[PDB]
């Protein structure tokens, strides 16, 4: 207990896989999907990795289509580095981070601390997605 709780956050705009511009409690704020490693569609280098667009097409719809978006704090720091709040985005009770990590659209990633609350979860879905030969693992 005294663990966590989510707070509603209203959408504004989906940027890229791990990047969601969401109107958070007051002023507009960018947020980064916590713990996933989803490919890009922007980068002056690399370019548009395979599953790049797709991975994003997932995120944009999960959130754009949700009825109630709650965001979740990680025991590290809301301030990321680019500002971009770090959080656990949910869409109608579902974890947007896991969904992508389960449909093979971002591998588990950037392990740090004390953020890890959902570590052995994204881990189990990914394995499953790994057992399967889904999208990113094919």
């Amino acid at each position, epitope marked *: 207990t005294k663990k966590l709780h989510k707070e509603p956050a209203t959408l504004i705009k989906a940027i890229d896989g791990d990047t969601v511009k969401l109107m958070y409690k007051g002023q507009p704020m960018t947020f980064r999907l916590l713990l996933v490693d989803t490919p890009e569609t922007k980068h002056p280098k690399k370019g548009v990795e395979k599953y790049g667009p797709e991975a994003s097409a997932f995120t944009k719809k999960m959130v754009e289509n949700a009825k109630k978006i709650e965001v979740e704090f990680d025991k590290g720091q809301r301030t990321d580095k680019y500002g971009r709040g770090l959080a656990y985005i949910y869409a109608d*009770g579902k974890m947007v981070n896991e969904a992508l990590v389960r449909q093979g659209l971002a591998k588990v990633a950037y392990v740090y601390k004390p953020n890890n609350t959902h570590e052995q979860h994204l881990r189990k879905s990914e394995a499953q997605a790994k057992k399967e030969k889904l999208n990113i693992w094919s």
Partner: antibody
Amino acid sequence: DVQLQESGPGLVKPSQSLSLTCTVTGYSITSDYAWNWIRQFPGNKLEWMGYITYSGTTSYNPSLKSRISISRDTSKNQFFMQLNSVTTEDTGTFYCTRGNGDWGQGTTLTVSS
Amino acid sequence: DIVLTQSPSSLAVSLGQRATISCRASQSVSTSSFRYMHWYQQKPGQPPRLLIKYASNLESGVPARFSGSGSGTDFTLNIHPVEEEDTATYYCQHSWEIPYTFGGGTKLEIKR
């Protein structure tokens, strides 16, 4: 691997609660076997009831929300569902389903004289 | 709240011939990984079983005769080399938004 055992049949008078269930082999429930309750009136009518996830909160279909619920006895590997104030308009089978595969063999409930 | 309509309500096909089951969506359900419609099969006395995962995309274990197609709102399940065990009622489901609405049902009869 993966199995969905549910409570047996149940005649019930119109208005006196009961709880279906889904013990779940091939797992334990934590990382999720996200339930997704379904109803099926005698004849042919799959109606989505609602769901419940790893987080704990649930999400009941707009249509018929309150007086119907979904619980979580994980150690005793189960999620439950209650239909308070049962009505004749409630007779049918109820299937729990995992949020990525398998369905349960369903529970039949009836409600008459 | 999208209402799905699949027809005809009854499908009787000569054993070994094609069978196309249609499922129409009120609103459109597609995107860039979506075609958010899946297909279920239900034998009598039994619970539905998953057949296809995202319009196309056969599930695991399901034979290769089943094939879903469809863009926008017209989605169809194809089971061409149709067989004896293909007697069942096949439903469509959408997960573009909750409530997840199921299909009205399409009964498949095999003639001989």
